[PDB]
Amino acid sequence: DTVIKVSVLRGPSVIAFADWLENPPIIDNKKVQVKVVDSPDLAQALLIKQETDIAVLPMINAANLYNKGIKIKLAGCPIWGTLYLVEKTPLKEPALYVFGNGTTPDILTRYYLGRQRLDYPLNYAFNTAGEITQGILAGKVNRAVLGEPFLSIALRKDSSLRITADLNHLTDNDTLGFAQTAVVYTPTMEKYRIAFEDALRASCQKAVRYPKETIHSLEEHGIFAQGALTPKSIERCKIYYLSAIEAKDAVMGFLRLIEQYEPKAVGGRLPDAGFIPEKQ
Amino acid sequence: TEDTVIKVSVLRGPSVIAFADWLENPPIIDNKKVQVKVVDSPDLAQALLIKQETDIAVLPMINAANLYNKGIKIKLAGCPIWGTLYLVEKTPLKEPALYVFGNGTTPDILTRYYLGRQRLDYPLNYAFNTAGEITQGILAGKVNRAVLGEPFLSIALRKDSSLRITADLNHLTDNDTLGFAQTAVVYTPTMEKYRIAFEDALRASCQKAVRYPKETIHSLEEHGIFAQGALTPKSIERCKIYYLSAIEAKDAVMGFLRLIEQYEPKAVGGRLPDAGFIPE
């Protein structure tokens, strides 16, 4: 092999990796090659087939694959801002529309509503964020949960719409929030783990420090439509890389929460200690 | 485990700043490593003491008083943090209402005490009953005046350049004491022989925060204690990180517990703690 293949599930995690599209890092005389994939399913298939080396996909999938015996480990999490509640004023029909029934966004919305003692009726009519966005714009949806870029698009195209809550935290003292997104790697990547984490830290820093340039590059590479993201969109994504060792409590706490609602979503148990590399 | 480590629990919040250096550089006392574990809530901190699963704990002074009164075998070592609420406002000041969180509890009580001492007649609004809701509400542009503590004060002030600090709730006179002692470091009976060693180590850790704020913040971020960018060196200054032994802080302790106990007797155990709370 002469390249390091990185598969990023389509979504806001590509923002953390943007500078690797712009300026692919070279590790051990291998170019790091980022490809956006359109579903967790497709991302999982690539990992199982050993057609990708590193993949970025939901933490619940990472846990499930690990529990099922797939040879991956968790490197860490690069993005911390994935779910926000939006509401229109005035609030006509009050159903809260939620995409991804049975998966992270749904479970976290249910958690938030319970914690805050709100009991809005959940509507699962739209399974995707894009569909929810369109429902807002067409007048069907007055309250919803969204992440970027759909959040930004909805806010732009309906200037009545407002963010009313941040759904990314276990508690108020939890400024870090949930480790909902996993960077996972295969065994031949162990020797490159620290090198790739170092480069990912740089890419994450660049997104945060140079958002306009980051957006510009993503647009040139066709990842997002022109004007879909703004620097505020990047701010809401809360881009920062933490190693799984450093974030072990945010990882296992998140997985435990999911398991309380839907144990099958993580494969029936919390991953054992081999999920995270040793400190060595 | 007694022969091996000294277990220190710290409640996640601004007082972890005092202990930040022990994340990378935990001290060794009597050939035992100090092991810091950050806990998410006061209830979790209390449970560790009730169940005798931690050696030293750092939790709100009100909880420490409550446990002492209920016969839990702890003593107060001292207080490592002196920052209180701050009052913030936007100009223009479109609405005079002062938004407060924690109705009937410490932040509300300190706010009412301050406004009373200063003879200020602001109407009080509790629609955002946590500080996360207020910062959000300030972000939304519904809040022109509020009380906030760290880190939410830094998070709020950052997002909004119109937002400014107008008061340190501690500032009533021309010669202010360091202020109320709101955070307890408490210890169990087998820790007596270690009291001076631990206090000296905690003084060193506190001074490190003050002297090396950037490095301190970076360590806190890299260990996932605070979200990246939450804290700035000014945040550290506003926290007033400084360890003072309980006997030296006696008036600051008892003065504070007298305020809380007049308005919220349940929180302190229904009486002020007797003398054995604060050893000489």
For residue A162, the distance in angstroms to the closest alpha carbon of chain B comes to 8
CATH number attached to the domain at A1-80+179-280: 3.40.190.10
Enclosing H/E stretch for B263: helix B250-263
Within the 4-33 window of chain B, which residues sit less than 8 Å (CB to CB) from chain A? 11-13
- Please state whether B224 falls in left (phi above 0), alpha (psi between -120 and 50) or beta: left
Whole-angstrom distance, CA of residue B4 vs CA of residue A135: 59
Domains A1-80+179-280 and A81-178 share a fold: yes
Q: Which residue has the tokens 């706010």?
A: B111
Whole-angstrom distance, CA of residue A167 vs CA of residue A278: 31
Residue A253: strand, helix, or coil: helix
> Which CATH topology does A81-178 take?
D-Maltodextrin-Binding Protein; domain 2 (3.40.190)
Residues pairing with B164 in the sheet:
B89
Whole-angstrom distance, CA of residue B49 vs CA of residue B55: 8
Annotated resolution, angstroms? 1.8
- Residue A78's φ and ψ, nearest 5 degrees, are -105, -5
> Which CATH topology does B1-82+181-280 take?
D-Maltodextrin-Binding Protein; domain 2 (3.40.190)
How many angstroms separate the Cα of A90 from the Cα of each of A71, A141, A142, A154, B142?
A: 51, 12, 8, 16, 16
| Beta strands in chain A, from DSSP E residues, in sequence order | 3-9, 26-27, 30-37, 54-58, 73-79, 84-87, 96-97, 122-123, 143-146, 162-166, 181-185, 239-243
A247 and B229 within 8 Å at the Cβ level: the answer is no
Q: Is B132 on the interface with A (CB under 8 A)?
A: yes
The bridge status of strand B75-81 relative to strand B183-187 is: antiparallel
Whole-angstrom distance, CA of residue B224 vs CA of residue B23: 11
Q: What tokens does A218 get?
A: 């993503």
Arch. (CATH architecture) of B83-180: 3-Layer(aba) Sandwich (3.40)
What is the signed CA dihedral for B30, B35, B38, B44, rounded to 10 degrees? -70
For residue A42, the distance in angstroms to the closest alpha carbon of chain B comes to 31
Q: What tokens does A103 get?
A: 């998966």
Distance in Å from the first CA to the final CA of chain A? 27
Experimental method: X-ray
Please tell me which residue of chain A has the smallest CA distance to B158.
A235
DSSP A25: -
Whole-angstrom distance, CA of residue A76 vs CA of residue A74: 6
A-chain CB neighbours of B20 within 8 Å are none
The bridge status of strand B145-148 relative to strand B86-90 is: antiparallel
Q: What tokens does B91 get?
A: 């100009």
For chain A, what are the domain ranges? 1-80+179-280, 81-178
A176 and B132 within 8 Å at the Cβ level: the answer is no
Within the 229-268 window of chain A, which residues sit less than 8 Å (CB to CB) from chain B? 238, 240, 242, 246-247, 249-250
Q: Is A198 on the interface with B (CB under 8 A)?
A: no
Q: Are B143 and B99 in contact (CB under 8 A)?
A: yes
Residues pairing with A85 in the sheet:
A145, A165
